[PDB]
Each structure stands twice: as structure tokens, then as C-alpha cells.
Amino acid sequence: AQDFDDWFSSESTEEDQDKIVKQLHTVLQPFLLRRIKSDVETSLLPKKELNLYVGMSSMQKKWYKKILEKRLLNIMMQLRKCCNHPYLFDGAEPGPPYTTDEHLVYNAAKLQVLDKLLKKLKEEGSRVLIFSQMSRLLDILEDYCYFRNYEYCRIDGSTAHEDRIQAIDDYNAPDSKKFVFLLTTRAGGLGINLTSADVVVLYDSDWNPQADLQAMDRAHRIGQKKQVKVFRLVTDNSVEEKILERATQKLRLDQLVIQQNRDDIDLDELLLKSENKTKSLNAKYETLGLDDLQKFNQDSAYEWNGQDFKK
DNA sequence: TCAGGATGTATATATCTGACACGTGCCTGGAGACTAGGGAGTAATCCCCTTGGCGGTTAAAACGCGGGGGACAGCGCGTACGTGCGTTTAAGCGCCAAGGGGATTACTCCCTAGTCTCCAGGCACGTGTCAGATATATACATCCGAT
């Protein structure tokens, strides 16, 4: 192990990072292969990443602060919950009695952006795939979809086989009244084919970039006819930014190592600002080096606006 | 049911003996230095535990049904307990005798512990293995529900 882990794995020596160890793919080219599907058939249209940076709402603000200064362990997971929808937390939503009115969208900034974009795509007429990462979050999405009078088909770690096949077939009927079609990002194996869809909204980003790559390939898989778009909601100035940063670290690591040597927020302004942020971070991480890329800076996310590790 | 008994149940009085208050001294808790080592805070490393989600195998668990036998209700009945009365008998209470047992109370010493100072050699840890305990199958002999 240590031989590979030290000879051209992580060091701290010199500009070796891109002068020698980077050039040392000659160890690998002998026995490894991959034929880039981007240009061997040239029949698919490329991808469309439209990361959206979103800020907390008041309920998110107070809940985020509550977790920062307190069953609740694994704080890094809880902050992801609060960044998605506070209704995941017990006793957050108003009630009882429990209703399903605009008090649902009224407390989740991602869900507000999602609702606006869902209306916009619906009037365009692009049936959409939602790839959440918590099945419990799919419950709130189901409730919202029903309250907005859309119909769906949910597949996750609960539905048995026959349910999965019949739901897929129902969505893929040649004249199917299926607008939204929920799933979980790492579920369904690989046989699930949804080329008939048009948009994949990555409600959450994943630690492993290739998990989402395979996920957002469920619509980009061979056979897809028209250019597709894949949104990725991000909670600006929160843990999700750290997660996206580390995921991009790993994605560029993969590319360098292998892929070379083959209220409303006025949606348009948020789109442009988030696109500028994406360009800025891409510029930040493009120029990194192997040993430099492997640091995993592990910036403690407990402190967010000034914290003291106290309750 | 009601009047006839039998039994607690309040009530006033006198007795007493046990709880309480009071002075002494002697012993222990408090004030006051002095000091050293236990513990709080810090840094580094590694293994375990969390939270949310997924996929799969496959025995247990849930459900329904039918039928028996165990439960619970009654019916005698014939004891074996109760209740009451008379009468011994023993518990308790005093008293006699002389000792030994024991618990302070106060010196003495011996000797046997604790303390320190090296220093080897017991033991815990990290390495192999191979022998015992598995799971498998099969033949058997051995209880259980109907004549």
C-alpha cells in the first residue's frame, strides 16, 4: 500500500505535483482503458449545468442558528436538512391542524425557487425528473405536487420491483400525463431509462460527484433526443457550498488523473449571479495541483458567522 | 328489625420517669504559611459511532381455523378449623454469691510496615499455525396418536 501511497500519491516536496507525478501516467496507460462516449457516436447533445445559489429564509435563519447553538447528532447532516426544508424537523411547520397551503412553499427558499421554475417549465411543457437525496424530503415534494395539482410517480428504497417497472412504464407511456417524476439520486440501479424526460433538478448535491454524474445521466443516457438541462440548487453561504467545493475537488481530481489520458427572488438575477459564482469557483479550482488538490482542507463548518464551540 | 350483649372509645387523675436545660474542660476544627504533585488544557493519532439512504435473502411473525381440554360455575359433604370455658404451667420478677470478660487509660519498645534506589526478568503484545468445533448429509432408533 505505502509504495503506491507514497511514490506518486500525496507528497509535499516541490513542483513535482505537475512536473513529474502528473506525467507519471505511464504507469497506468499499459493496463487501463476508456473510450470517451462524447465523440464516438456524436449523437447526443451535451449537458447544461445551471447551479443556483439561494439564501436562507427567516425560518431557515432561526433554525440554522438553533442547530448551531442547540434527537440531533451529525450536525453536518442536520444543516443539510435545514438547507432543504425545515419541515423535515419535527414540530417546525405551523399546526396542528395541518394544512397544505402556501405555508409549505412559504418556508423553504429552495422550494420557492423550485416552484417558480416548475411553473416556468410547465408552461414550456418539459416533464421533469427530481433527484432528491432524502426520501423523507420526497414526502414534502409529493405533498407540494399534489397541492399544485400535478401528478407524479415516486420510486425510492421503498417501492418493490413490480411497482418500479409499472411506474417507469406509466411515465414512459407515449401519451403520458406525467409532469414530475421523483426518485432518489443513488437508487434504481442502472437499468432505469428515462430519456423521454427533459430536466433533472438535483435538489441536493452529493459527496461523490460521480453519483450525481450517473444520476443526471439517467436522462442523458443513450437514446435521449433533445438537449436537456440539469439544475442543482445550492444554499448559498452554508454547508452546501462546502459540499459543492469538495465535490468539485474530487471531480477535477478524476478528470486530471484519468479523463485526460484516455418572497420571490426574481429568478433571472439569481441565475446570473449563481452563474458568475460558478465561473469564479471553476477558475479557483482549475489551477490546483495533485498534492495540492488532495489536501481536503476540512474547513470546520460549525463556525458560520462567529462561533465558539459552545452549545 | 330490635333489643341484648360485647367491645372499643373518649375522659379525668395520679404517677413517673424520660426529655430537656445548664455548667466544664478538653479536644478538635480553624487560621496561617509552605510546598509539591494531581488535574485541567493542549496537541497528535487512530478506531468506533452517528445519520440518512440503498439492495437482497430468507426465516420468523402475523393470520385464520378447527377442535379439544382446561378453566370456572355449581352441588354436596364431611371434615378440620373456629370459638368458648376451665385449668394448670410457665414467663417474668425479684434476690443471692463469686469469679472472669472487656473496655478505657497510660506508658514502653520491638519490629515490621513504608520510602527510596537500582536493576534484571515477568509479562503483555504482536506475530504465525493447526486442531477443535462447526456446519453438512444419512441411517436409526425411539416416543406419539389411532386399533
UniProtKB/Swiss-Prot annotation:
Report the protein's function: Catalytic component of ISW1-type complexes, which act by remodeling the chromatin by catalyzing an ATP-dependent alteration in the structure of nucleosomal DNA. They are involved in coordinating transcriptional repression, activation and elongation phases. The ISW1A complex represses gene expression at initiation through specific positioning of a promoter proximal dinucleosome. The ISW1B complex acts within coding regions to control the amount of RNA polymerase II released into productive elongation and to coordinate elongation with termination and pre-mRNA processing.
The miscellaneous annotation reads:
Present with 1500 molecules/cell in log phase SD medium.
The entry assigns this protein to a family as follows: Belongs to the SNF2/RAD54 helicase family. ISWI subfamily.
UniProt keyword annotations, A-Z? ATP-binding, Chromatin regulator, DNA-binding, Helicase, Hydrolase, Nucleotide-binding, Nucleus, Phosphoprotein, Repeat, Repressor, Transcription, Transcription regulation
Gene assigned in the entry: ISW1
Q: How does it assemble?
A: Component of the ISW1A complex, which at least consists of ISW1 and IOC3. Component of the ISW1B complex, which at least consists of ISW1, IOC2 and IOC4.
- GO molecular function ontology, one term from the record: chromatin binding
Q: What is this protein called?
A: ISWI chromatin-remodeling complex ATPase ISW1
Covered part of the full sequence, start to end and full length, is: 378 to 752 of 1129
Record's GO cellular component, any one? Isw1a complex
Which GO terms fall under biological process for this protein? chromatin remodeling; DNA-templated transcription elongation; negative regulation of IRE1-mediated unfolded protein response; negative regulation of RNA export from nucleus; positive regulation of transcription by RNA polymerase II; regulation of chromatin organization; regulation of DNA-templated transcription; regulation of transcriptional start site selection at RNA polymerase II promoter
Record's subcellular location: Nucleus
Q: Where is the Helicase C-terminal domain?
A: 113-262
Q: Could you tell me which species this protein originates from? A: Saccharomyces cerevisiae (strain ATCC 204508 / S288c) (Baker's yeast)
